[PDB]
Amino acid sequence: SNRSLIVTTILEEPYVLFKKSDKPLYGNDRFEGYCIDLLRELSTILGFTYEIRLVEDGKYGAQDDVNGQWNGMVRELIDHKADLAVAPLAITYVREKVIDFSKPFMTLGISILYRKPNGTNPGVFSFLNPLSPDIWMYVLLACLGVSCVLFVIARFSPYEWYNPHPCNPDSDVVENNFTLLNSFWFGVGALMQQGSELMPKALSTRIVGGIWWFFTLIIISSYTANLAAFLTVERMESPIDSADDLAKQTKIEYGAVEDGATMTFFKKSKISTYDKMWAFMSSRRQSVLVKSNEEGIQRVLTSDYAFLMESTTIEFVTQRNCNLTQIGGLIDSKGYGVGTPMGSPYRDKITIAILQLQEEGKLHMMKEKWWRGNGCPEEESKEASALGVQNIGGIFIVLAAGLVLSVFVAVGEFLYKSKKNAQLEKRSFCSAMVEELRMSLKCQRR
């Protein structure tokens, strides 16, 4: 029938926390958190009766050097007003001089919080990138230009008018093949490297086709080479994953809680990587050292802000917000711990207790309960450097647009020929219906 114990906690999340319910009448039934699950299991295997009681200051603990005294939870331990400190109260060199701890039950770390890479969004015309929109207009102007020149040269040049029926010699007919329609077909035929028939014959037309070929060879070998340059630097581009990789940047900005434990590390740092990281912060001590963790989250979502905090509070917000991530490893290495008054007969019986809960694996079950929650749809890390339908893609759009464009021209040829010969003969339909049957007659004659 010993005295019940009096623990002092602080309202952090997923740490101790009011039970979300109506009908208010509660003793120790107010609080519902990670540590209240921890205080329950430590009470079972040691056999004591706790009585939770919040801290009055609302602070962890610090030493006002002017007064030379303490505040917060750690003052309640010194004056023996409480005797347990089940809390996120970390382990520092200044605290252990005054009060006594147990062994750690969670491992902290400093790590970088930052927005996920949102995506690419190439737009499904990305094949059209490696030349300027001036060049794609000028090439199409050149192919209409050179075709209109080649039609004019093939009229005037007398060596072009050769003899048709080349297999039937000794007649009197001449015919050049470069009409207006075929002259575009030589230009388009040479532009897409496929060649054509009706090659130029006279030397005045050999020069035009001889120099248009050299125009196509430089364009297509430039489009192939430049598209290799886009796809090389995209795979060669890597997202940042370090503190040192984020140290070299200047466009992406740092951040911390004002006069917290994170700022304390960088002023006392001696690493050359971390030394310049304090130099960028102290240069900008108006816009990145914001106030606290709650304002540090909001600045990441609305900027290029790369806030730094402890590794636990990263792992709770990345599970509750799938926009965010945990770039980088662990900078520092700290730990939590149940605190006790100086020289008390409980720093051992909790040290025994925390290890026994570790052997049975309960601390990992208590962490996966509270820190995972409403399981994220996360994965979606496609990033596949292989041309899908997000990229090239739209070449099938202009392909299908061309084939539909052809069918309206095919109706145009079908109507124009059917109304041409019908002005010589039978009126409209008995000329048109017999052409559809002559089409539908599968025999290769008529």
Ligand X SMILES: O=S1(=O)NCN(C2CC2)c2ccc(F)cc21
Ligand Y SMILES: CC(C)CCC[C@@H](C)[C@H]1CC[C@H]2[C@@H]3CC=C4C[C@@H](O)CC[C@]4(C)[C@H]3CC[C@]12C
Ligand Z SMILES: CCCCCCCC/C=C\CCCCCCCC(=O)O[C@@H](COC(=O)CCCCCCCCCCCCCCC)COP(=O)([O-])OCC[N+](C)(C)C
The binding site for ligand X (CB under 6 A) comprises 91, 103-107, 333-335, 354-355, 358, 363
The CB-of-19 to ligand X minimum distance in angstroms stands at 26
Contact 437, 446 (CB under 8 A): no
Is 95 marked as a binding-site residue? yes
Taking the complex as a whole, the smallest distance from the CB of residue 105 to its own copies amounts, in Å, to 10
Nearer to ligand Z, 233 or 409 (CB): 409
Query: Residue from 223, 278, 370, 414 that binds ligand Z (CB under 6 A)?
Result: 223
- Which residue, among 38, 121, 112, 11, has the nearest Cα to 332 in the 3D structure? 112
Both tokens of residue 187? 């230009």
Q: Is residue 262 marked as binding?
A: yes
66 binds, among ligand Z, ligand X, its own copies, none (CB under 5 to 8 A by kind): none
Tokens 């902290």 -> residue: 108
Binding mask 174-213 for ligand Y (x = CB under 6 A): -------x---------------------x----------
Please say whether the beta carbons of 340 and 101 come within 8 A: yes
The answer to whether the annotation marks 438 as part of a ligand binding site is no
Instruction: Give the one entry of ligand Z, ligand Y, its own copies, none that residue 135 binds, where binding means its C-beta sits below a cut-off of 5 to 8 angstroms depending on kind.
Output: its own copies
Query: Where are the strands (E) in 284-349, listed by range?
Result: 308-310, 324-325, 339-340
Contact of residue 434 among its own copies, ligand Y, ligand X, none (CB under 5-8 Å per partner type): none
The residue whose Cβ lies closest to ligand Y is 412
Q: Which residues is 7 bridged to in the sheet?
A: 52, 84
- At its nearest, how many Å lie between ligand X and the CB of residue 105? 5
The number of beta carbons lying within 10 Å of the beta carbon of residue 412 is: 10
Peptide bond into 14 cis (omega under 30): yes
Cα 319 versus chain centre, distance: 17
State how far the Cα of 62 lies from the Cα of 246, in Å rounded to an integer: 31
CA distances in angstroms from 345 to 84, 93, 100, 101, 342, listed in the order given: 11, 21, 10, 11, 9
Total site size for ligand Y, rule CB under 6 A? 7
CA distances to 68, 370, 424 from 50, in Å = 32, 22, 112
* 413 counts as binding ligand Y under rule CB under 6 A: yes
Tell me if 422 is assigned to a ligand binding site: no
**How far apart are CB 143 and ligand Z at their closest, in Å?**
7
Query: 27 CB contacts (<8 Å, ≥6 apart)?
Result: none
Cβ closer to its own copies: 31 or 101? 101
Q: Which of 336, 333, 293 is nearest to 317 (CA)?
A: 293
Of 94-123, which residues contact ligand Y (CB under 6 A)? Answer: none
Chain residues that interact with ligand Z, rule: CB under 6 A: 123, 125, 128, 133, 136, 139, 152, 155, 179-181, 184-185, 188, 191, 206-207, 210-211, 214, 217, 219-220, 223, 398, 442
Q: Residues comprising the binding site for L-glutamate? A: 88, 90, 95, 261-262, 310
Chain residues binding ligand Y by CB under 6 A are 159, 181, 203, 409, 412-413, 416
